[PDB]
Amino acid sequence: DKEVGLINSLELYTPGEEHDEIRDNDIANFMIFGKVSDRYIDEVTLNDNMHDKIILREEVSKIIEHIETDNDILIASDL
């Protein structure tokens, strides 16, 4: 007996499959109301010249280098 089953309390994050046009409306909504879609992040996180749409944090590369060498992460910050 063997079965893959279903995962109930966790959801697998599937990356987007298309490019969405980004208007100033989306920038204003993201920077004011906090509204965003995962396609926005997938579009601006594929390249790295897009400094007119998201603040590129330097901790991302260090965190990725740390996780790729078998080490867990614990992020803590303010409000």
Ligand X SMILES: Nc1ncnc2c1ncn2[C@@H]1O[C@H](COP(=O)(O)OP(=O)(O)OP(=O)(O)O)[C@@H](O)[C@H]1O
Binding partner of 30, given ligand X, a copy of itself, none, CB within 5-8 angstroms per partner class:
ligand X
The answer to the question of whether 67 is labelled as a binding residue is no
Site for a copy of itself in 23-52 (CB under 8 A): 25, 28-29, 33, 35
Partner in contact with 13, chosen from ligand X, a copy of itself, none, beta carbon below 5 to 8 Å by kind:
none
End-to-end CA distance of the chain: 49
Q: Which residue is nearest to ligand X (CB)?
A: 55
Residue 40 binds what, of a copy of itself, ligand X, none (CB under 5 to 8 Å, by partner type)?
none
In Å, how far are 22, 24, 32, 54, 74 from 29, measured between CA atoms?
11, 8, 5, 13, 29
The Cα-based distances of 49 to 9, 13, 45, 46 in angstroms read: 36, 24, 10, 10
Closest by alpha carbon to 22, among 35, 36, 40? 40
By CB under 8 A, name the binding residues for a copy of itself: 25, 28-29, 33, 35
* Residue stretches of the annotated binding site for ATP: 30, 55
